[PDB]
Design an enzyme around this catalytic site. Structure first.
Site, PDB file in Angstrom:
ATOM      1  N   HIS A   1     158.918 -55.683 -60.782  1.00 47.68           N
ATOM      2  CA  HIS A   1     159.011 -55.607 -59.548  1.00 47.68           C
ATOM      3  C   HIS A   1     158.230 -56.902 -57.814  1.00 47.68           C
ATOM      4  O   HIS A   1     159.670 -57.028 -57.325  1.00 47.68           O
ATOM      5  CB  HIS A   1     159.789 -54.416 -58.931  1.00 47.68           C
ATOM      6  CG  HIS A   1     161.025 -53.651 -59.066  1.00 47.68           C
ATOM      7  ND1 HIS A   1     161.058 -52.316 -58.393  1.00 47.68           N
ATOM      8  CD2 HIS A   1     161.142 -53.238 -60.480  1.00 47.68           C
ATOM      9  CE1 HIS A   1     161.700 -51.940 -59.114  1.00 47.68           C
ATOM     10  NE2 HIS A   1     162.236 -53.097 -59.915  1.00 47.68           N
TER      11      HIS A   1
ATOM     12  N   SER B   1     162.617 -60.605 -62.186  1.00 47.65           N
ATOM     13  CA  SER B   1     163.413 -60.350 -63.328  1.00 47.65           C
ATOM     14  C   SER B   1     163.888 -61.746 -63.660  1.00 47.65           C
ATOM     15  O   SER B   1     164.252 -62.598 -63.150  1.00 47.65           O
ATOM     16  CB  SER B   1     164.377 -59.280 -63.438  1.00 47.65           C
ATOM     17  OG  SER B   1     164.418 -59.241 -64.265  1.00 47.65           O
TER      18      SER B   1
ATOM     19  N   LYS C   1     175.027 -50.246 -66.751  1.00 52.95           N
ATOM     20  CA  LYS C   1     175.209 -50.440 -68.075  1.00 52.95           C
ATOM     21  C   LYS C   1     174.044 -49.549 -68.367  1.00 52.95           C
ATOM     22  O   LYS C   1     173.969 -49.789 -69.973  1.00 52.95           O
ATOM     23  CB  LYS C   1     174.326 -52.323 -67.733  1.00 52.95           C
ATOM     24  CG  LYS C   1     173.982 -53.091 -68.643  1.00 52.95           C
ATOM     25  CD  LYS C   1     173.689 -54.296 -68.354  1.00 52.95           C
ATOM     26  CE  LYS C   1     173.299 -55.267 -69.379  1.00 52.95           C
ATOM     27  NZ  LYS C   1     174.655 -55.583 -70.485  1.00 52.95           N
ATOM     28  N   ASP C   2     173.174 -49.376 -68.197  1.00 47.70           N
ATOM     29  CA  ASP C   2     171.870 -49.107 -68.512  1.00 47.70           C
ATOM     30  C   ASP C   2     172.442 -47.078 -68.712  1.00 47.70           C
ATOM     31  O   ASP C   2     171.828 -46.807 -70.015  1.00 47.70           O
ATOM     32  CB  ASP C   2     170.630 -48.567 -67.318  1.00 47.70           C
ATOM     33  CG  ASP C   2     170.150 -50.084 -67.071  1.00 47.70           C
ATOM     34  OD1 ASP C   2     170.749 -50.754 -67.713  1.00 47.70           O
ATOM     35  OD2 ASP C   2     168.820 -50.164 -66.604  1.00 47.70           O
TER      36      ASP C   2
ATOM     37  N   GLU D   1     152.493 -44.470 -90.314  1.00 54.31           N
ATOM     38  CA  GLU D   1     153.531 -44.354 -89.907  1.00 54.31           C
ATOM     39  C   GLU D   1     154.304 -45.515 -90.207  1.00 54.31           C
ATOM     40  O   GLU D   1     153.861 -47.035 -89.918  1.00 54.31           O
ATOM     41  CB  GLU D   1     154.276 -43.747 -88.623  1.00 54.31           C
ATOM     42  CG  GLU D   1     153.656 -41.836 -88.845  1.00 54.31           C
ATOM     43  CD  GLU D   1     155.084 -41.887 -89.539  1.00 54.31           C
ATOM     44  OE1 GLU D   1     155.595 -42.276 -90.497  1.00 54.31           O
ATOM     45  OE2 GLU D   1     155.620 -40.534 -89.954  1.00 54.31           O
TER      46      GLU D   1
HETATM   47  C1  HEM Z   1     156.146 -47.976 -72.447  1.00 50.14           C
HETATM   48  C2  HEM Z   1     157.080 -48.840 -72.661  1.00 50.14           C
HETATM   49  C3  HEM Z   1     157.279 -49.420 -72.116  1.00 50.14           C
HETATM   50  C4  HEM Z   1     158.172 -49.671 -70.888  1.00 50.14           C
HETATM   51  C5  HEM Z   1     159.082 -48.392 -70.684  1.00 50.14           C
HETATM   52  C6  HEM Z   1     158.694 -50.772 -70.379  1.00 50.14           C
HETATM   53  C7  HEM Z   1     159.493 -50.296 -68.319  1.00 50.14           C
HETATM   54  C8  HEM Z   1     160.104 -52.137 -68.333  1.00 50.14           C
HETATM   55  C9  HEM Z   1     161.204 -52.016 -67.226  1.00 50.14           C
HETATM   56  C10 HEM Z   1     161.498 -50.730 -66.966  1.00 50.14           C
HETATM   57  C11 HEM Z   1     161.384 -53.384 -67.568  1.00 50.14           C
HETATM   58  C12 HEM Z   1     161.867 -53.615 -66.474  1.00 50.14           C
HETATM   59  C13 HEM Z   1     163.280 -53.769 -66.767  1.00 50.14           C
HETATM   60  C14 HEM Z   1     163.445 -55.069 -67.674  1.00 50.14           C
HETATM   61  O1  HEM Z   1     163.086 -55.897 -68.096  1.00 50.14           O
HETATM   62  O2  HEM Z   1     163.573 -54.111 -69.073  1.00 50.14           O
HETATM   63  C15 HEM Z   1     160.261 -53.935 -68.051  1.00 50.14           C
HETATM   64  C16 HEM Z   1     160.005 -55.648 -68.296  1.00 50.14           C
HETATM   65  C17 HEM Z   1     158.985 -55.785 -68.891  1.00 50.14           C
HETATM   66  N1  HEM Z   1     158.558 -55.511 -70.162  1.00 50.14           N
HETATM   67 FE1  HEM Z   1     158.344 -53.248 -70.184  1.00 50.14          FE
HETATM   68  N2  HEM Z   1     158.327 -51.435 -70.428  1.00 50.14           N
HETATM   69  C18 HEM Z   1     157.341 -51.447 -72.502  1.00 50.14           C
HETATM   70  C19 HEM Z   1     156.915 -51.793 -73.146  1.00 50.14           C
HETATM   71  C20 HEM Z   1     156.545 -53.133 -72.841  1.00 50.14           C
HETATM   72  C21 HEM Z   1     155.893 -54.133 -73.561  1.00 50.14           C
HETATM   73  C22 HEM Z   1     155.225 -53.199 -75.087  1.00 50.14           C
HETATM   74  C23 HEM Z   1     155.897 -55.633 -73.507  1.00 50.14           C
HETATM   75  C24 HEM Z   1     155.156 -56.518 -74.099  1.00 50.14           C
HETATM   76  C25 HEM Z   1     153.862 -56.326 -74.254  1.00 50.14           C
HETATM   77  C26 HEM Z   1     156.506 -55.165 -72.186  1.00 50.14           C
HETATM   78  C27 HEM Z   1     156.351 -56.700 -71.812  1.00 50.14           C
HETATM   79  C28 HEM Z   1     157.551 -56.750 -70.700  1.00 50.14           C
HETATM   80  C29 HEM Z   1     158.074 -57.979 -70.440  1.00 50.14           C
HETATM   81  C30 HEM Z   1     157.828 -58.955 -70.555  1.00 50.14           C
HETATM   82  C31 HEM Z   1     158.950 -57.341 -69.477  1.00 50.14           C
HETATM   83  C32 HEM Z   1     159.835 -58.414 -68.489  1.00 50.14           C
HETATM   84  C33 HEM Z   1     161.220 -57.905 -68.557  1.00 50.14           C
HETATM   85  C34 HEM Z   1     161.923 -59.761 -67.930  1.00 50.14           C
HETATM   86  O3  HEM Z   1     161.573 -60.407 -68.203  1.00 50.14           O
HETATM   87  O4  HEM Z   1     163.473 -59.510 -67.900  1.00 50.14           O
HETATM   88  N3  HEM Z   1     156.783 -54.211 -71.653  1.00 50.14           N
HETATM   89  N4  HEM Z   1     159.208 -52.819 -68.925  1.00 50.14           N
END
Ligand code: HEM
Ligand SMILES: CCCCCCCCCCCCCCCCCC(=O)OC[C@H](COP(=O)([O-])OCC(O)COP(=O)([O-])OC[C@@H](COC(=O)CCCCCCCCCCCCCCCCC)OC(=O)CCCCCCCCCCCCCCCCC)OC(=O)CCCCCCCCCCCCCCCCC
Ligand SMILES: CCCCCCCCCCCCCCCCCC(=O)OC[C@H](COP(=O)([O-])OCC(O)COP(=O)([O-])OC[C@@H](COC(=O)CCCCCCCCCCCCCCCCC)OC(=O)CCCCCCCCCCCCCCCCC)OC(=O)CCCCCCCCCCCCCCCCC
Ligand SMILES: CCCCCCCCCCCCCCCCCC(=O)OC[C@H](COP(=O)([O-])OCC(O)COP(=O)([O-])OC[C@@H](COC(=O)CCCCCCCCCCCCCCCCC)OC(=O)CCCCCCCCCCCCCCCCC)OC(=O)CCCCCCCCCCCCCCCCC
Ligand SMILES: CCCCCCCCCCCCCCCCCC(=O)OC[C@H](COP(=O)(O)OCCN)OC(=O)CCCCCCCCCCCCCCCCC
Ligand SMILES: CCCCCCCCCCCCCCCCCC(=O)OC[C@H](COP(=O)(O)OCCN)OC(=O)CCCCCCCCCCCCCCCCC
Ligand code: HEM
Ligand code: HEM
Ligand SMILES: [Zn+2]
Lengths: 74, 116, 455, 487, 294, 32, 49
Positions: free
Chosen positions: E207, E211, E233-234, E277
């Site tokens: 945030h 994004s 959408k979500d 797993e």
């Molecule tokens: C507990 C698991 C995770 C949750 C709840 C989570 C949650 C979120 C949320 C809410 C966003 C913002 C909405 C979105 O762009 O989809 C986001 C974005 C992002 N997440 Fe995660 N995430 C998780 C795991 C990961 C992992 C493992 C990675 C990679 C190592 C990651 C990398 C990113 C990146 C790069 C973005 C940027 C989105 C964009 O570029 O538009 N996330 N994540």
């Protein structure tokens, strides 16, 4: 020449053209539906209500009593 | 009833104790009214003259400094203190009366408290 | 509920009988309250009543201490009083549905209120309260002062008012020279107690006129005497003095055009009724326009200046010729707004016109007839709009102590002649030139160079 | 030891302010015996007395109406044609306005120079204007000189002569007039709002029309338009001031004879290609403009709709607010209080426009680029509050304000004549003051709620915005704000 | 705008932070459904937490009672089979959704500047998920559970100087017995809350820097508010995920697992096929492929 | 305004009671 | 979580003081002036515990 974005400011027209690649436009005379949409949304809404009640009751009744205890109630 | 120190020994003792405390910290009774408390005090302070409000802020800063240092005003200025010489109650009463009238007939609140 | 679709009369109504189709022409009744106050009224056929309170005060009565009290008082007109709060005042005005206005001029200033004829006691009571019993609160005065400072910051947008103020200041010395728009230093110096003292010193009974437009005189006096009869009787301190001798004001601003204005004395004043009427007719003959209006015939496109200058000379933005008459003084002249390069030629043309009217034989009898007819028409079509009727009653009683009947103005305009026009122009041109310039003034001629003419 | 209040300049200031406050604490009844800030109804029947507006219908279908007051000295004589920019044919949009400009000029004997010389010699004025579906040519004149004005009006409306050089000059003038209107942002906003609301309908097209169409007049379109739309049944002659009804009737009968007999009736013309409201928005972002001006609008009521008076009351209780308004933070309407107290707008104005078979109703705000979201919330909140929770004191105040505004606006000879003509064209009759007051008084809280539910509750809106409008909420925001989920 | 009287509850201080960061956050107008996958991973985490709490209301962390306690949950508890299948298959769907999240990030290069902190916090989150799922899978105490715990904990001996000490300390007593079972239950209960904290930090950093979008370009020209445009959408994504997850729960609940975990742990015999797993399998394959366990 | 307010409050109370019955279907309480 | 919300609200309006008066005239930062005070408190609590 005219920058073509002040032309639209200076020349309001009654014939307005939209994109119409994702959504077909109603002909102008037709009324706004506004009811089909709400009824579709209502069907989905009480589907959601059913789902939420199911989940809540599953959790609470899981935290409730058990069959072996009820058997041992004598 | 209305109990004043002239017609009540208990009220006389109460006023004496309040005078002693305020004189110890050297701040008038009206200085205890928090602008954040009511928001009517805030308006009343917004309507008062700058000299009066600046004196109020100076007295409050002096009191807070004395509180931090764990000491009281020296006996000279303590004898020079004038608590209960009000400067705010009339303006606060006017503001509350105006608010009451506005609320009584139609009207929206001129100011409101945020939540929270 | 059902309704008759608005093209059919609504069920049963108790609609009253119409007026008798030329009922009568109401006269103005004037009663002099023994403390020295004036209450005047007249009858109107329309269901609207305009009631105003007019005072002999303003910039002329300002003092170096005050110097802005008139403008501030116009801004602080219907604020909180010692009996009602500002909120209560606004709620009352809205409740009956009327409109409040305040006007502040150099010599006199008034407070007007408009509503249906039913609400006469409400109108007169609220007006008398707001004038007689003001409570100049510091916070309200500060709010109005902030707004006045902003308005002073947004002044250049209208160069005409700026040039009128400049001409008055330059070509008068004390009284009429006192400014009307409260410069910034005066605005900072102004205060609530200063307004209180100024009002209490000047808003006195022997200089108050309460004029009604559509109100029965008996009702008006019966509701106003218990509200004004107890004012103190004062000896009416004398009016200020002001001499005319004056030269040039020059101010430099933006690069869009230059605005030059010229003016003269004509010391007759409103008490010299003949000369005031001749001056009004001369103004209606001169007049002109802005060369950008697209209204239609009748707006003076056949006036002398319009025809000659505008139909002959282009690249001249606007060209008008105006006047302002105060008690025992006048000020008539020409406003010009033109391109910066043309400005010396524009000044030459304006001088040529002002001398053309002076020399005999240069004004045609037909042009004079058109001017006289247009003046009569303007006055007559202005004496509708009951607001204007009440304002005229108030101003005339303040100036002359009575209401001069319209037939006097009409007869004077009728009897004006070409010899009168020429003589008045010759007298008005003799007085020293007053000149003002605003804008790209770094190219306009010098005051003495312009004053080489006219003499 | 304690210093007296004489020293301690802050003590002196406190004493002075307390003295003033205790001064203004005691009121007086002799100046309060009539105020009553709480609004209430009243019966002005003793006051609503005006001369009868005599109406005559010459058998060619021509209506002539007079409201004589022979004690006056001026008069207003004019013609109110039931035609305007709505009744064009999509290729002659600017014809009405251009015909106005031309008909000022000349006839077979008027000779524009000497025509205007005659007008200004008699001292009168002559003006005209065209609305979307109304056209007016009126003249203000004096007593014993009315007949010349009536003759001039008849001559210009019947035997006007159009010449090519004057047409070229007026083409130049109207192109200049088109180039000067974009400075006036309010008219641009309302033109865009009309175009985007009544799109693909004759009400959408502007009054001036397109320059590409103004360049192709050739005077054949002018003559065809005048012969097809200035027919006898669609015109009204009106007179006020010092006039005589019989004299006016005789003069109209003797003069208006070379008219355009035809059958194009505006009722049947509107029966085809009606007006259809289509919820949409147009937003022209600039960000180089200091102020953002926008307008939201619901579909209104027609001229003859009995709910038109209710809509007038509703737009009276959302009254306009201005940054130099006298009331300021204290005002009758909740929207004005919200706007003034929080200073979220430079100026707001609620508008109610009535046409045939449709209309408009909106709030016309003008603000600064950063307060737009709060301003929009205030506007929508107050409108839907009118839907749900109207108050009796507010309704009474609105009715009083409406009565006062109408009767104060009708002031003079030209306003009376304009009222006569406009009412005769819209309703076919002039509504008397007593009946108008009765109709307004028939509006109460239940009426306001019913009408607002009919026109505002969960209805599409049309938005037109210009300037820095990054913060202005999108269409879905307003569309959802048209209803409340709490009730 | 001076906030004298309150207009909207959403702009009040009680709901102001929530307003900004949930309703009014500007979002690129051209986002596809993989941002929905990120939100879906959040929902999967919440589902896991809730079902895990209600499961731990019935699970005994003792070596002599864990397996029979789980069979208690399946057979006796009112609607307990639903809770257990939801927990297990929800772990699986959590990993599926996180994998799709990661691979969208790789495809659109969302790891690039200025979202380096977002990517790094994501890597930390992935580590936490791996550890939590592993220690949780040890809990049912079957053949696969016990032997996978044994192998994966005993490969920690590869550390040069302190490997054996760390292995023995983590084991608590020369084997993977009751002490390790209690230890793993406590850690499995604790870790999801650290995972919630890590997710909140992840979202906060994103945030901060906006994004990304399918174009990878600067996207401050055409931006729309998050609600309602991306909430709907979500929501479509969530309902589709619910259908998928309901297919897995009710009709094929044991496909994503191994049948050896239904045999009580017997440290004497060894099952012929010891694998973790399915969502640890790539890492296991890398580690097994490169020999010399160090 | 008070009649409308109390009517709306009663309507919301009916909705709340319906939601309560839906969540906890009690024919045991409904029958007597 | 509830403790964090507690602290967030307090920080929204600021802490009170023994006099109970408005105290935006004489204010100092938390660190280090109240950090050391709370340190004395923590060590005394540690001895008690
Ligand atoms: C507990 C698991 C995770 C949750 C709840 C989570 C949650 C979120 C949320 C809410 C966003 C913002 C909405 C979105 O762009 O989809 C986001 C974005 C992002 N997440 Fe995660 N995430 C998780 C795991 C990961 C992992 C493992 C990675 C990679 C190592 C990651 C990398 C990113 C990146 C790069 C973005 C940027 C989105 C964009 O570029 O538009 N996330 N994540
Ligand atoms: C406080 C309430 C009012 C408010 O301000 O609401 C905020 C806000 C908007 O409220 P609003 O602006 O007043 O109303 C606008 C819409 O009408 C608001 O209406 P809406 O249509 O947006 O609301 C729909 C709502 C309606 O809710 C109800 O009717 C209840 O239903 C939901 O939100 C459904 C959520 C998704 C459910 C589907 C499953 C998600 C994934 C998890 C699956 C778990 C199960 C796994 C498989 C199990 C198999 C057995 O509501 C939401 O954000 C929701
Ligand atoms: C929880 C956070 C919201 C608390 C309520 C704030 C509020 O006023 O919400 C309505 C408020 C309506 O906008 P507003 O600017 O306050 O305008 C209020 C209307 O004038 C007037 O709006 P209204 O009176 O129609 O709605 C007031 C609303 C207030 O809610 C309640 O009283 C409950 O009451 C209800 O919805 C009654 C529902 C009873 C069942 O905000 C929304 O509807 C937006 C909700 C967004 C939820 C986003 C969820 C994202 C999830 C991502 C994962
Ligand atoms: C389990 C794995 C899938 C889970 C669901 C993934 C998802 O959200 O897909 C949404 C994705 C559509 O997302 P979107 O918001 O329309 O835009 C995303 C891409 O821009 C859509 O770009 P595109 O439509 O050019 O991609 C072509 C299409 C797959 O196109 C092909 O397979 C082309 C034919 C290749 C063989 C010949 O892509 C997909 O179906 C998604 C990627 C599958 C890998 O795919 C579908 O909904 C499937 C039907 C299309
Ligand atoms: C019933 C109680 C009636 C009290 C009436 C007002 C008394 C005011 C007063 O001065 O009380 C004496 C004392 C506080 O005053 P003070 O002696 O100044 O204390 C600080 C220095 N010793 O002590 C008090 O004020 C104590 C009051 C206790 C009230 C208990 C009520 C049950
Ligand atoms: C982690 C820090 C707390 C998280 C919630 C939060 O930050 O706001 C709670 C609010 C603080 O007030 P705040 O919005 O910061 O005031 C002006 C800021 N623009 O404090 C409040 O007034 C409401 C606290 C309740 C938070 C529930 C959401
Ligand atoms: C604080 C929240 C959580 C609690 C209290 C919790 C508690 C439990 C308990 C008691 C068990 C054993 C019950 C059983 O055998 O089905 C279990 C199993 C499991 N948990 Fe969790 N858990 C939580 C969150 C998670 C999370 C976030 C994951 C990661 C996806 C996870 C992954 C697993 C796995 C893989 C199993 C083994 C599934 C199986 O029984 O075959 N848990 N959890
Ligand atoms: C988990 C237990 C609690 C924690 C960790 C906690 C934490 C804090 C903290 C850190 C502060 C700011 C520092 C301070 O002012 O002392 C504070 C202030 C405050 N707390 Fe708590 N608190 C707790 C319980 C409570 C309870 C039970 C109440 C009363 C119901 C309460 C009421 C207050 C009040 C009124 C303040 C304002 C202090 C002031 O006057 O400035 N707290 N708390
Ligand atoms: Zn034009």
């Amino acid at each position: 020449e005219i920058p073509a974005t002040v032309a639209a400011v200076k020349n309001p027209s009654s014939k307005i053209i939209y994109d119409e690649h994702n959504h077909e436009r109603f002909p102008p005379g037709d009324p706004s539906k506004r009811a089909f949409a709400y009824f579709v949304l209502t069907g989905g809404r009480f589907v959601y209500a059913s789902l939420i009640r199911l989940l809540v009751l599953k959790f609470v009744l899981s935290m409730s009593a058990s069959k072996d205890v009820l058997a041992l109630a004598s | 009833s209305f109990l004043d120190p002239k017609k009540n020994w208990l009220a006389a003792q109460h006023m004496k104790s309040l005078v002693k405390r305020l004189s110890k910290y050297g701040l008038r009774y009206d200085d205890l009214y928090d602008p954040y408390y009511d928001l009517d005090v805030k308006e009343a302070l917004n309507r008062l003259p700058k000299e009066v409000v600046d004196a109020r802020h100076a007295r409050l800063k002096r009191a807070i400094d004395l509180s931090m240092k764990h000491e009281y005003l020296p006996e000279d200025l303590q004898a020079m203190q004038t608590p209960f010489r009000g400067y705010l109650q009339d303006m606060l009463a006017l503001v509350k009366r105006e608010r009451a009238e506005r609320e009584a007939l139609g009207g929206l609140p001129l100011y409101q408290r945020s939540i929270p | 509920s059902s309704l008759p679709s608005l093209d059919i009369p609504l069920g049963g109504v108790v609609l009253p009988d119409p007026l008798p189709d030329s009922v009568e022409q109401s006269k103005t009744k004037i009663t002099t309250l023994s403390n020295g106050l004036k209450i005047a009224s007249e009858t109107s056929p329309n269901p609207a009543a305009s009631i105003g309170l007019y005072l002999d005060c303003g910039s002329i009565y300002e003092t170096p201490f005050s110097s802005g009290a008139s403008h501030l008082l116009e801004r602080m007109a219907f604020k909180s009083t010692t009996n009602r709060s500002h909120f209560r005042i606004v709620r009352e005005v809205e409740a009956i549905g009327g409109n409040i206005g305040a006007s502040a001029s150099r010599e006199q200033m008034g407070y007007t209120f408009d509503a249906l004829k039913t609400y006469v006691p409400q109108m007169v009571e609220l007006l008398v309260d707001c004038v007689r019993n003001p409570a100049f609160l510091d916070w309200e005065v500060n709010e109005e002062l902030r707004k006045v400072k902003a308005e002073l910051g947004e002044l250049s947008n209208n160069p005409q008012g700026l040039l009128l103020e400049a001409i008055h200041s330059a070509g008068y010395s004390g009284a009429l020279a006192y400014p009307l728009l409260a410069p910034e230093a005066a605005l900072n110096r102004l205060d609530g107690p200063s307004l209180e003292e100024f009002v209490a010193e000047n808003y006195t009974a022997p200089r108050m006129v309460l004029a009604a437009a559509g109100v029965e005189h008996e009702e008006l006096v019966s509701i106003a005497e218990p509200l004004l009869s107890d004012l103190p009787n004062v000896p009416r301190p004398d009016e200020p003095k002001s001499v005319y001798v004056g030269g040039d004001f020059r101010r430099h601003g933006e690069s869009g055009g230059t605005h030059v204005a010229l003016a003269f004395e004509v010391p007759g004043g409103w008490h010299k009724e003949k000369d005031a009427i001749v001056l009004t007719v001369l103004q209606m003959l001169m007049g002109g326009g802005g060369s950008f209006s697209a209204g239609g015939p009748g707006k003076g496109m056949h006036s002398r200046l319009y025809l000659r200058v505008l139909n002959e000379y282009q690249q001249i933005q606007s060209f008008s010729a105006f006047n302002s008459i105060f008690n025992n003084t006048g000020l008539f002249g020409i406003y010009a707004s033109t391109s910066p390069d043309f400005a010396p030629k524009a000044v030459d043309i304006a001088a040529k016109e002002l001398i053309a009217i002076a020399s005999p034989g240069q004004v045609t009898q037909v042009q004079l007839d058109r001017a006289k007819k247009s003046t009569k028409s303007a006055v007559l079509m202005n004496l509708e709009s009951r607001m204007i009727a009440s304002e005229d009653i108030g101003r005339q009683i303040l100036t002359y102590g009575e209401r001069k009947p319209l037939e006097q103005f009409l007869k004077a305009v009728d009897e004006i002649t070409l010899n009168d026009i020429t003589k008045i122009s010759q007298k008005i041109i003799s007085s020293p030139l007053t000149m003002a310039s605003y804008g790209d003034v770094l190219s306009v001629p010098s005051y003495e160079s312009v004053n080489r003419k006219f003499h | 030891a304690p210093p007296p209040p004489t020293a301690m300049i802050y003590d002196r200031a406190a004493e002075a302010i307390k003295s003033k406050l205790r001064q203004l604490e005691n009121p007086d009844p002799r100046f309060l015996k009539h105020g009553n800030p709480r609004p209430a109804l009243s019966d002005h029947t003793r006051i609503l007395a005006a001369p009868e507006t005599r109406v005559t219908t010459l058998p060619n279908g021509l209506r002539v109406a007079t409201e004589s007051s022979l004690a006056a000295r001026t008069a207003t004589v004019g013609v109110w044609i039931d035609a305007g920019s709505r009744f064009e044919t999509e290729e002659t949009n600017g014809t009405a306005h251009f015909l106005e400009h031309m008909i000022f000029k000349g006839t077979e004997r008027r000779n524009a120079r000497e025509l205007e010389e005659e007008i200004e010699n008699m001292g009168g004025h002559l003006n005209a204007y065209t609305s979307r579906e109304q056209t007016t040519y009126y003249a203000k004149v004096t007593d014993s000189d009315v007949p010349q004005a009536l003759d001039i009006l008849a001559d210009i409306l019947q035997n006007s002569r159009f010449e090519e050089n004057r047409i070229s000059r007026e083409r130049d003038v109207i192109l200049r007039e088109m180039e000067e209107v974009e400075g006036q942002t309010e008219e641009v906003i309302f033109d865009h709002l009309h175009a985007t609301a009544f799109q693909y309908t004759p009400l959408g097209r502007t009054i001036l029309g397109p320059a590409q169409n103004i360049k192709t007049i050739t005077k054949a379109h002018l003559q065809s338009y005048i012969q097809t739309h200035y027919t006898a049944p669609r015109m009204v002659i009106a007179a006020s001031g010092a006039v005589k009804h019989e004299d006016i009737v005789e003069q109209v009968k003797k003069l208006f004879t070379k008219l355009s007999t035809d059958a194009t009736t505006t009722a049947q013309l509107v029966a085809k290609e009606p007006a259809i409201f289509t919820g949409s928005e147009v937003r022209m972002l600039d960000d180089d403009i200091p102020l953002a001006q926008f307008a939201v609008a619901f579909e209104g009521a027609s001229w003859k709709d009995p709910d038109s008076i209710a809509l007038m009351v509703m737009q009276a209780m959302l009254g306009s607010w201005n940054k130099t308004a006298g009331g300021g933070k204290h005002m009758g309407s909740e929207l004005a209080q919200r706007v003034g107290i929080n200073e979220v707008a430079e100026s707001i104005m609620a508008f109610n426009t009535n046409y045939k078979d449709t209309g408009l109703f909106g709030v016309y705000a003008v603000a600064k680029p950063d307060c737009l979201d709060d301003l929009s919330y205030a506007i929508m909140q107050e409108t839907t509050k009118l839907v749900y929770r109207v108050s009796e004191d507010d309704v009474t105040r609105a009715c009083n304000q409406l009565k006062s505004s109408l009767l104060l606006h009708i002031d003079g000879t030209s306003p009376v004549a304009e009222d006569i003509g406009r009412q005769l064209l819209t309703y076919g009759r002039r509504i008397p003051f007593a009946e108008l007051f009765a109709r307004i008084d028939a509006v109460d809280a239940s009426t306001i709620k019913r009408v607002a539910n009919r026109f505002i509750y969960d209805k599409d809106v049309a938005i037109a915005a210009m300037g820095p409008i990054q913060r202005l909420p999108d269409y879905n925001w307003f569309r959802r704000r048209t209803y409340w989920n709490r009730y | 705008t001076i906030r004298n009287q309150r207009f909207s509850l959403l702009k009040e201080p009680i709901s102001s932070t929530l307003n900004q960061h949930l309703i009014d956050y500007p979002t690129p107008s051209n986002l596809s459904y993989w941002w929905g996958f990120g939100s879906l991973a959040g929902i999967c985490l919440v589902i896991q937490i809730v079902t895990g709490v209600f499961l731990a209301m019935h699970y005994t962390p003792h070596v002599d009672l864990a397996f029979n306690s789980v069979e208690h949950v399946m057979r006796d508890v009112e609607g307990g089979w639903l809770l257990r299948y939801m927990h297990a298959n929800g772990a699986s769907m959590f990993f599926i959704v996180v994998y799709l999240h990661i691979f969208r990030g790789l495809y659109y290069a969302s790891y690039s500047s200025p979202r380096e902190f977002v990517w790094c916090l994501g890597v930390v989150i992935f580590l936490l998920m791996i550890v939590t799922a592993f220690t949780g899978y040890v809990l049912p105490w079957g053949q696969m559970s016990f032997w996978g715990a044994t192998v994966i904990t005993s490969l920690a001996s590869a550390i040069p100087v302190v490997g054996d000490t760390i292995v023995t300390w983590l084991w608590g007593g020369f084997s993977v017995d009751n002490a390790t079972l209690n230890r793993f239950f406590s850690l499995h209960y604790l870790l999801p809350f650290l995972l919630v904290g890590a997710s909140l930090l992840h979202l906060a950093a994103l945030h901060q820097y906006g994004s990304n979008n399918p174009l990878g370009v600067h996207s401050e020209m055409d931006q729309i508010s998050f609600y309602p445009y991306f909430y709907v959408k979500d929501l479509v994504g969530w309902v589709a995920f619910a259908i998928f997850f309901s297919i897995w729960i009710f009709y094929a609940p044991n496909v994503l697992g191994h049948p050896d975990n239904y045999i009580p742990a017997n440290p004497m015999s060894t099952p012929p096929h010891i694998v973790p797993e399915w969502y640890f399998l790539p890492i296991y394959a890398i580690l097994r492929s490169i020999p010399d366990k160090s | 305004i008070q009649p409308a307010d109390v009517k709306a409050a009663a309507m919301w109370g009916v909705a709340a009671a319906t939601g309560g019955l839906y969540l906890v279907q009690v024919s045991i309480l409904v029958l007597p």
